[PDB]
């Protein structure tokens, strides 16, 4: 079972182009994203600022991402993360 | 005690397809993880900031 | 010579196992220490 695992995930590591959104040239990839709150530190006057920690999670659909015949599904290394597209999201009124 | 080269050969051969993206007993059973802390010392408790400091050892 | 000692640092270099201390399985390595006090610059009784 662990061999298989090594080659799926090695086929959909491998020719992938993270400059490519996916679906490019296509129509729009829809992005979902929820948050969690953990805490709202420091609303402050004199600075106009509020602190906030949160998990933040995106939802996107990736066909060069598919694979079949394992029924679970794989939690990788964060790391991997560096070998694929990711959204290129941010915080508009962010200061750090 | 054993040669240098002996020593150097197992570490080299330990890797080799590894593929540290997958965790161990992945699809088959939960990884076990035992966890151990030494607390070197716990640092100021900041009562303005609901916050402490500690200094920890985690294995 | 200039060239003798050029490639003798990439001969030392060579072959040479980041890995493992000196005296793998030989007693413990020696280390010894100095430290030269350049400034205590700050003695803080608040923190
Ligand atoms: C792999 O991950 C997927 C995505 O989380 C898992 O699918 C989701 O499983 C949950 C729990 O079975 C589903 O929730 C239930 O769905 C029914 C029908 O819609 C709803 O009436 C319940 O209130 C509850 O929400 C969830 O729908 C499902 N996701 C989708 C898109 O259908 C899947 O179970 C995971 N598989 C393994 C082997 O880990």
Redesign the interface.
């Known amino acids: 079972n662990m061999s298989f695992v090594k080659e799926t995930v090695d086929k959909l590591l491998k020719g992938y182009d993270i400059r490519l959104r996916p679906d490019f040239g296509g129509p729009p990839v829809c992005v979902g994203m929820n948050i969690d709150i953990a805490s709202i530190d420091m609303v402050s006057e004199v600075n106009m600022d509020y602190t906030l920690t949160m998990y933040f999670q995106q939802y996107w659909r990736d066909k060069r991402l598919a694979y079949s015949g394992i029924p679970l599904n794989l939690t990788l290394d964060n790391r991997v993360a560096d070998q694929l597209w990711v959204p290129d999201t941010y915080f508009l009124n962010d200061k750090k | ?2 040669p ?1 080269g002996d ?2 050969v197992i ?1 080299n051969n330990l890797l080799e ?1 590894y ?5 161990p007993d ?3 059973k939960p990884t076990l993880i035992h966890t151990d802390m030494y607390v070197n010392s716990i640092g ?1 408790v900041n009562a303005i ?1 609901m916050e402490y400091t500690i200094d920890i050892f985690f294995a």
Do not use: M
């Open positions: 005690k054993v240098e020593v150097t570490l397809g593929d540290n993206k997958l965790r992945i699809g088959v100021p900031n």
